[PDB]
Amino acid sequence: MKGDTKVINYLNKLLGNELVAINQYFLHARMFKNWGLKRLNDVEYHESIDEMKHADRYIERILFLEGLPNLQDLGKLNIGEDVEEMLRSDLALELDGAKNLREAIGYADSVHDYVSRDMMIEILRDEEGHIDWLETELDLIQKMGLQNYLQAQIREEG
Amino acid sequence: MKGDTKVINYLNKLLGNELVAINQYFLHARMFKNWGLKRLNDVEYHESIDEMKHADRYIERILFLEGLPNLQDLGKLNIGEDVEEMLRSDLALELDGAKNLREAIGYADSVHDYVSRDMMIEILRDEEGHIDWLETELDLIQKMGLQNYLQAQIREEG
Amino acid sequence: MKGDTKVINYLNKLLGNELVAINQYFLHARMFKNWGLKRLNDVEYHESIDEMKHADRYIERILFLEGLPNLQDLGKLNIGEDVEEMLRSDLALELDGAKNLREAIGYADSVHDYVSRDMMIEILRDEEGHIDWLETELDLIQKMGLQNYLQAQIREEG
Amino acid sequence: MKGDTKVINYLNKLLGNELVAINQYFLHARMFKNWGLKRLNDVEYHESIDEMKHADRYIERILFLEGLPNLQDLGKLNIGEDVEEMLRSDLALELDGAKNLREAIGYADSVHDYVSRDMMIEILRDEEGHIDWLETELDLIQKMGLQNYLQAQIREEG
Amino acid sequence: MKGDTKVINYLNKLLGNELVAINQYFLHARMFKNWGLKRLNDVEYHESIDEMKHADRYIERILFLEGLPNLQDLGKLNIGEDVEEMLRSDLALELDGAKNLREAIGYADSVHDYVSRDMMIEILRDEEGHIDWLETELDLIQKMGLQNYLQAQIREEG
Amino acid sequence: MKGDTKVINYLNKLLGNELVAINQYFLHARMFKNWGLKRLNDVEYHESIDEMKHADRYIERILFLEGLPNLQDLGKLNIGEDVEEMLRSDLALELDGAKNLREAIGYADSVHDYVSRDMMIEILRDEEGHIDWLETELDLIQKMGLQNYLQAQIREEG
Amino acid sequence: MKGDTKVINYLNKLLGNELVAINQYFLHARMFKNWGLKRLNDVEYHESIDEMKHADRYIERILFLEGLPNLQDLGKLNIGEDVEEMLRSDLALELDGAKNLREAIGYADSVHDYVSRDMMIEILRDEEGHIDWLETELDLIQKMGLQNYLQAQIREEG
Ligand code: HEM
Ligand code: HEM
Ligand code: HEM
Ligand SMILES: [Fe+2]
Ligand SMILES: [Fe+2]
Ligand SMILES: [Fe+2]
Ligand SMILES: [Fe+2]
Ligand SMILES: [Fe+2]
Ligand SMILES: [Fe+2]
Ligand SMILES: [Fe+2]
Ligand SMILES: [Zn+2]
Ligand SMILES: [Zn+2]
Ligand SMILES: [Zn+2]
Ligand SMILES: [Zn+2]
Ligand SMILES: [Zn+2]
Ligand SMILES: [Zn+2]
Ligand SMILES: [Zn+2]
Ligand SMILES: [Zn+2]
Ligand SMILES: [Zn+2]
Ligand SMILES: [Zn+2]
Ligand SMILES: [Zn+2]
Ligand SMILES: [Zn+2]
Ligand SMILES: [Zn+2]
Ligand SMILES: [Zn+2]
């Protein structure tokens, strides 16, 4: 079913955000794993799978709407070298992606693509969950201090 | 444990090959799925997961060896517009990647990184399985003709 | 709870679309069944049940909003005499119904009937699934040819 | 128990036939497997195991009768390069072996080796089953055409 | 995937070794079985199945590499007439085959056929297990004497 | 089967490394256990069992190759008096042993003892896992501080 | 709890006996295993594990009593080249160790270390079980002769 061209472009831009997050979350996860921070590996890996699910939804939607998913262009990763820096980088990325989502959702409505909109609202709800987790962890670092925060990451949560 | 620098560079190059294959296999899978070619979606999606597992092994190995995994640079995807063209593109990509693997495996041996070598031989064995599947499908297209080949893809295999 | 009058009129128009689709899908299903095209019977019958579920939702919603569901007026069926013609007819009907849905969803929003809107977005998501299935089948007919396509319909899919 | 010398010679000749069939069926099976013709691999591999069971019976019988099983001499394989050619080659081989079996069974009777005869009649019954399968497949190739025949081989039968 | 020609020749030579061992182990097994030496039948039959598995791996590998498996040429069997002689003959054969394996493994490495090499190292590991079993049995014959050794073979081991 | 003499000498040297590690890991484990550091006892004890498994493989391999395993000579233990010192000592020992392994693996290849090589590559893979664990723990001590690190050891991990 | 210094020295001497027995029993076990003497491997390996358990008890006791377990010094192994010689060597070693145990048990009593004594009496009871097994086997060799004795070792006991 031929979709609106600018909806497809938005879907590809949002797909691009997901592709960056997939990689950045996955590297961050395995860095934490390497450092023995088991709990942070489990969550960040899970965040990565979440983004893969989001990318898959975009790809299938773009294809249904008869567009060409773009998996060739990869935006900038900002990896970071310590726990706080990497968590903040994930947060900045989530925030920019949520901004793009809000723009796309408004636009899909105005051209009556209510199912692309509905999909995107579900994804944004997931993103705000990701934002909440990052914000909470970053605040915990400050509240209990880094040494205590790191000790709390060495065992996986049941 | 500080690894050999050129082994790490090879691991990053091989990781780069996997990142291209992950995306190309995943798009191809969902294109087939869109077209109703259920069987080709299932296999290509599975090939994609295989490459993700390979990428994960590289990332963890690079990190152990104290290098920086590179997930920022993404080589060229060659998507293709019809079944044969997309299968051939996956094959060309596999063949180039197997070539790089052979070079890396020889080099790891000469610097005594026998566990990076061992990991890479396991991965190459998987790649040759991927090559075999692609070659077989492409030959089946020619042998039974495209119409019959397409009809054989519409139901998933048990 | 007294609903908006024009929302009720939209709900009745959309109900009318569903009543046409229920009958056209059901006849098409049993035509396919008669012809031994088991797989097409199963899917079209299922599409028919889907439309019945949609009609039921409209009826219950209209009644809640204190309107009179209209099951008396039945729009034009376009049955068709061969597989392709009947599938295209179902597609044209789905496309017109999706158009009406988009109009109604926009209008419900402007009068703040957010639950009629929410119901209608769910239904449209189902309709786009129906559209996708029809488009895919029609493309498969062209790609594998009619004889092969027909052979692929004689056994039901597990 | 000292057997008749010419019965032992017949048993060794029949053993020789089985050794050829074991190898030819096994190669043919893996050629089909390589080509993605899963169904033909399964049946030909099974035919190969059948011949191994036949060879085992001959070996044990020759030994009981106090002869020397001959596994050293291997007659001519005729492999063939395409499906029809390889199936016909298996058929020609089965037909020659059935001929030898008929001769041996007649002879065993005339020297009162009724248990060698009984074993050989069971084996011939199996061989005629193998002949029937080959003849049927070859006729199916002609009836549905090679392209359709090949498409029908790509999935294993439950 | 077109393999190296000399690797294919090595694979065919190694296949040839396996074909000899399959037959020699299988005859030896049924000779032992005839003699009531149940335990030696079970192990030698098992060794025979092992060699069949090895031959199958070679055949599939040669075919993947686009060569022609050679099951036509059968090297010399050395059957032997008593337990010690037959066990020694199996040992001499294993030793020659291990020698050929070592040569082939070195060569596959030098042309970067690391998966043929990997397969062959697995097979050699199995062969050294076969060598160990033969050497052990032969030493047991000398240590406990032949009469005691034979008595120990008449019941199968749980 | 008579092995290469220098391979046997390497196997005995590597066995010697394992015998040192068995004892040093086992004492370290029970020191941690005494101190109430349950988690460190469990892992170090497990590392000790791993080394015992490695020693067993060497012993069995040396014996197969017809050499004399040397369990008489025991190299220097470096026990250490506090957690960090003992973990570093285990690390230094692992690193020297990995060095010896790399040398032996290269040599086994050059004399075509591919199964001793294969065994040793498996063992080295295990050793690099041991190295990774030690490095990670030592870095955790510095990152969270010793007091927090010690508190994290008092309960065993599920 | 600060133990008596001479008790700790006795515990270390007894530990030293156990470390010799662990190694000698383990090598003897794998020599028997190599020779196909399955039953002797199972028992000697088990005796080895028993000594490991004894060593562990000493180590934990020494540490509790605030001494330094000595795993660095390893007394003389006497391996032996044939079954009888190796069994006698294990026996001589057990006998010397039982002698040391008797001395230590008497001394622990005189300084009121009744729990070290109690532990040591349990260990001595185990040692006398080991002595009994060795004496019995050695007498069986003489009674049934070596050839019969060896034949009786080739299958493991249920
Ligand atoms: C590029 C770096 C990536 C890495 C390292 C990676 C890694 C992984 C791993 C380890 C898994 C678990 C395998 C399993 O399902 O059992 C997984 C699952 C999955 N991946 Fe990826 N992936 C990557 C990118 C992608 C991309 C680009 C997509 C496309 C949208 C994708 C889609 C999926 C999906 C749909 C699953 C299955 C989710 C589930 O059911 O658990 N991944 N990935
Ligand atoms: C030529 C003399 C041979 C004899 C007498 C023989 C005999 C047997 C027998 C009795 C079996 C057990 C049947 C079963 O699987 O239940 C067997 C299994 C098998 N044979 Fe043969 N065989 C011979 C040669 C070969 C050859 C040349 C190949 C080709 C590589 C081969 C491949 C196999 C395989 C793959 C199995 C199944 C293994 C398993 O899963 O148990 N055999 N053979
Ligand atoms: C010298 C100091 C040693 C100590 C204190 C020690 C201690 C232990 C203990 C407590 C166990 C657990 C018992 C069980 O299996 O339930 C064990 C297991 C074992 N040990 Fe030792 N051991 C030592 C040396 C050795 C040596 C030199 C070897 C020879 C290679 C060895 C081989 C084994 C094996 C094969 C196991 C069984 C592993 C399993 O399946 O859990 N050990 N050891
Ligand atoms: Fe989630
Ligand atoms: Fe796979
Ligand atoms: Fe449905
Ligand atoms: Fe059969
Ligand atoms: Fe085996
Ligand atoms: Fe481990
Ligand atoms: Fe015991
Ligand atoms: Zn996302
Ligand atoms: Zn997110
Ligand atoms: Zn890969
Ligand atoms: Zn691949
Ligand atoms: Zn509907
Ligand atoms: Zn519909
Ligand atoms: Zn037969
Ligand atoms: Zn047959
Ligand atoms: Zn073999
Ligand atoms: Zn073998
Ligand atoms: Zn080790
Ligand atoms: Zn280690
Ligand atoms: Zn003891
Ligand atoms: Zn003892």
Q: What approach was used to elucidate this structure?
A: X-ray
Residue ranges covered by each domain of chain A: 1-158
Amino acid identity at D70? N
Select from D134, D18, D21 the least CA-distant residue to D84: D134
Q: Which atom of ligand 3 is nearest to the CA of F55?
A: 30
Conformational region of residue A2, where left means phi above 0, alpha means psi within -120 to 50, and beta covers everything else = beta
Torsion of CA A64, A65, A68, A70, to 10 degrees: -90
Is chain G touching chain E, with at least 3 CB–CB pairs below 8 Å? Answer: yes
Q: Is F144 on the interface with B (CB under 8 A)?
A: no
Distances (CA, A) of G123 to E152, F132, G14, G23, G56: 38, 38, 10, 18, 11
Name the closest residue on chain E to residue G148, using Cα atoms: E144
If you measure from the C-alpha of residue A45 to the centroid of ligand 11, how many angstroms do you get, rounded to a whole number?
Answer: 13
CA distance E61 to E116: 7
Select from A33, A35, A57, A55 the least CA-distant residue to A45: A33
Verify whether ligand 3 is closer than 6 Å to residue G52 (CB atom): yes
Verify whether ligand 1 is closer than 6 Å to residue B29 (CB atom): no
Q: Is residue C38 within a helix (H) or strand (E), and if so which, with residue range?
A: helix C38-64
Q: Are A11 and A55 in contact (CB under 8 A)?
A: no
Select from E155, E153, E101, E106 the least CA-distant residue to E127: E101
Burial class (CB in 10 A: 0-12, 13-18, 19+), D154: buried
Q: Ligand 1, residues B11, B30, B52: which to mutate, most atoms within 8 A of Cβ?
A: B52
Q: Are B74 and B20 in contact (CB under 8 A)?
A: yes
G 36-55 residues with CB below 8 A of E? 36
If you measure from the C-alpha of residue B51 to the centroid of ligand 5, how many angstroms do you get, rounded to a whole number?
Answer: 9
DSSP assignment letter at C112: T
CA distance D3 to D65: 4
Residues counted in chain D: 158
- Locate C138 and state its tokens: 């029609």
* Cβ atoms within 10 Å of B79's Cβ, excluding its own: 17
For testing contact with chain E, the best of B105, B128, B136 (most E CBs within 10 A): B128
Q: Are D3 and D66 in contact (CB under 8 A)?
A: yes
CA distance E101 to E108: 10
Rounded to 5°, the CA angle C38-C43-C47 comes to 145
Distances (CA, A) of A123 to A60, A69, A102, A119: 14, 18, 11, 6
Distances (CA, A) of E36 to A72, E47, E50, E88, E137: 70, 18, 23, 20, 17
- Locate B147 and state its tokens: 């119409």
Going by C-beta distance under 8 Å and a sequence separation of 6 or more, which residues neighbour residue E49?
none
DSSP assignment letter at B3: P
Torsion of CA G12, G18, G23, G26, to 10 degrees: -160
Distances (CA, A) of B35 to A34, A60, B158: 42, 11, 20
Contacting chains of D (3 CB pairs or more, <8 Å) are: B, E
Q: Is E60 on the interface with B (CB under 8 A)?
A: no
Distances (CA, A) of A19 to A31, A49, A54, B74: 19, 11, 9, 11
The DSSP-derived string for D95-122 is HHHHHHHHHHHHHHHHTT-HHHHHHHHH
Select from D114, G148, E112, A60 the least CA-distant residue to C136: A60
Euclidean distance between the first and final Cα of chain C, in Å? 45
Amino acid identity at B10? Y
Q: Are B32 and B40 in contact (CB under 8 A)?
A: yes
Q: Are D55 and D18 in contact (CB under 8 A)?
A: yes
* Cβ atoms within 10 Å of G6's Cβ, excluding its own: 14
Query: Binding-site residues of D, please?
Result: 18, 46, 50-52, 54, 94, 127, 130
- Locate D85 and state its tokens: 């050619």
Among the partner residues F27, F72, F76, nearest to G69 by beta-carbon distance = F27
* Cβ atoms within 10 Å of F52's Cβ, excluding its own: 19
Q: Are G92 and G39 in contact (CB under 8 A)?
A: no
| Beta carbons of B30 and A63 less than 8 Å apart | yes
The DSSP-derived string for chain E is -PPPHHHHHHHHHHHHHHHHHHHHHHHHHHHHHHTT-HHHHHHHHHHHHHHHHHHHHHHHHHHHTT-----S--------SSHHHHHHHHHHHHHHHHHHHHHHHHHHHHTT-HHHHHHHHHHHHHHHHHHHHHHHHHHHHHHH-HHHHHHTTSS---
Query: Binding-site residues of E, please?
Result: 18, 46, 50-52, 54, 94, 127, 130
Going by C-beta distance under 8 Å and a sequence separation of 6 or more, which residues neighbour residue G82?
none
Verify whether ligand 1 is closer than 6 Å to residue B49 (CB atom): yes
Going by C-beta distance under 8 Å and a sequence separation of 6 or more, which residues neighbour residue B140?
B149, D35, D36, D150, D154
Beta-carbon pairs below 8 A across chains E and F: 21
Q: Using the CB atoms, write b or e for A114-143: b if 16+ within 10 Å.
A: bbbbbbbeebbeebeebbebbeebbeebee
Angle between helices F114-144 and B114-144 (to 10 degrees): 110
Torsion of CA D126, D130, D132, D134, to 10 degrees: 180
CA distance A66 to E40: 68
Amino acid identity at D118? D
Going by C-beta distance under 8 Å and a sequence separation of 6 or more, which residues neighbour residue C21?
C47, C48, C51, C90, C93, C94, C97
Task: Find the DSSP H helices in chain G.
Answer: 5-34, 38-64, 83-110, 114-144, 146-151
Query: Binding-site residues of F, please?
Result: 18, 46, 50-52, 54, 94, 127, 130
Distance of CA D18 to the CA centre of its chain: 6
CA distance E2 to E24: 33
Rounded to 5°, the CA angle F2-F6-F7 comes to 65
Q: Which residues of F fall within a CB distance of 8 Å from A36?
A: 136-137, 139-140
Among the partner residues E31, E63, E64, nearest to D63 by beta-carbon distance = E31
User: How is domain D1-158 classified at the architecture level of CATH?
Assistant: Up-down Bundle (1.20)
Conformational region of residue B66, where left means phi above 0, alpha means psi within -120 to 50, and beta covers everything else = left
Separation in Å, CA of E58 to nearest CA in chain B: 15
| Beta carbons of F115 and E106 less than 8 Å apart | no
If you measure from the C-alpha of residue C54 to the centroid of ligand 6, how many angstroms do you get, rounded to a whole number?
Answer: 11
Burial class (CB in 10 A: 0-12, 13-18, 19+), C156: exposed
3-state secondary structure of A106: helix
Q: Which residues of F fall within a CB distance of 8 Å from E132?
A: 1, 64
| Beta carbons of A115 and C121 less than 8 Å apart | yes
Q: Is F106 on the interface with B (CB under 8 A)?
A: yes
Select from F64, F92, F88, F74 the least CA-distant residue to F18: F74
| Beta carbons of G158 and E158 less than 8 Å apart | yes
- Locate G54 and state its tokens: 């004894």
Q: Is A144 on the interface with F (CB under 8 A)?
A: no
Q: Are G34 and E136 in contact (CB under 8 A)?
A: yes
Q: Looking at ligand 3, which residue's alpha carbon is closest to its atom 14?
A: G49
- Token pair 């049955």 is at which residue? C79
C 118-137 residues with CB below 8 A of B? 136-137
Q: Is residue D63 within a helix (H) or strand (E), and if so which, with residue range?
A: helix D38-64
The DSSP-derived string for D4-62 is PHHHHHHHHHHHHHHHHHHHHHHHHHHHHHHHT-HHHHHHHHHHHHHHHHHHHHHHHHH
Whose atoms come closest to the Cα of A51: which ligand? Answer: 11
**Phi, psi angle pair for F24, to nearest 5°:** -70, -50
Q: Is residue B54 within a helix (H) or strand (E), and if so which, with residue range?
A: helix B38-64
Q: Are F8 and F65 in contact (CB under 8 A)?
A: yes
- Token pair 């013609």 is at which residue? C85
Q: Looking at ligand 2, which residue's alpha carbon is closest to its atom 22?
A: D52
Select from A81, A82, A79, A17 the least CA-distant residue to A51: A17
Select from F24, F17, F27 the least CA-distant residue to G56: F27
CA distance B45 to F16: 48
Conformational region of residue D2, where left means phi above 0, alpha means psi within -120 to 50, and beta covers everything else = beta
Amino acid identity at A18? E
CA distance C76 to C89: 11
Task: Find the DSSP H helices in A1-158.
Answer: 5-35, 38-64, 83-110, 114-144, 146-151
Angle between helices A38-64 and A114-144 (to 10 degrees): 170
Among the partner residues C102, C106, C131, nearest to A1 by beta-carbon distance = C131
Among the partner residues G148, G154, G158, nearest to E140 by beta-carbon distance = G154
3-state secondary structure of A86: helix
Q: Is B91 on the interface with A (CB under 8 A)?
A: no
Q: Are D11 and D65 in contact (CB under 8 A)?
A: yes
Going by C-beta distance under 8 Å and a sequence separation of 6 or more, which residues neighbour residue D93?
D17, D20, D21, D24, D78
Select from A155, A141, A108, A127 the least CA-distant residue to A54: A127
Is chain F touching chain A, with at least 3 CB–CB pairs below 8 Å? Answer: yes
Distance of CA G13 to the CA centre of its chain: 13
Q: Which atom of ligand 3 is nearest to the CA of F53?
A: 35
CA distance D97 to E85: 34
Q: Is E143 on the interface with G (CB under 8 A)?
A: yes
3-state secondary structure of A37: coil
Q: Is A151 on the interface with F (CB under 8 A)?
A: yes
The DSSP-derived string for F22-78 is HHHHHHHHHHHHHTT-HHHHHHHHHHHHHHHHHHHHHHHHHHHTT-----S------
If you measure from the C-alpha of residue E78 to the centroid of ligand 18, how many angstroms do you get, rounded to a whole number?
Answer: 28
Q: Are A40 and B67 in contact (CB under 8 A)?
A: no
Going by C-beta distance under 8 Å and a sequence separation of 6 or more, which residues neighbour residue F20?
F74, F75, F76, F77, F93
Going by C-beta distance under 8 Å and a sequence separation of 6 or more, which residues neighbour residue G60?
F30, F33, F34
Going by C-beta distance under 8 Å and a sequence separation of 6 or more, which residues neighbour residue B23?
A19, A71, A72, B74, B77
Query: Can you say whether the dihedral through the CA atoms of G79, G80, G83, G86 is positive or negative?
Result: negative
Distances (CA, A) of F59 to B130, C52, F9, G17: 40, 75, 12, 21
| DSSP collapsed to 3 states, C128-156 | HHHHHHHHHHHHHHHHHCHHHHHHCCCCC
Q: Which residues of E fall within a CB distance of 8 Å from F114?
A: 102, 105, 121, 124
Rounded to 5°, the CA angle C101-C103-C109 comes to 100
Select from B99, B90, B102 the least CA-distant residue to B131: B90
Burial class (CB in 10 A: 0-12, 13-18, 19+), D134: buried
Among the partner residues B34, B151, B155, nearest to C148 by beta-carbon distance = B151
Q: Are G30 and G79 in contact (CB under 8 A)?
A: no
Among the partner residues E95, E106, E128, nearest to F115 by beta-carbon distance = E128
Header resolution in angstroms: 2.4
Q: Is E76 on the interface with D (CB under 8 A)?
A: yes
CA distance F51 to F25: 9
CA distance F3 to F120: 15
Q: Are G70 and G16 in contact (CB under 8 A)?
A: yes
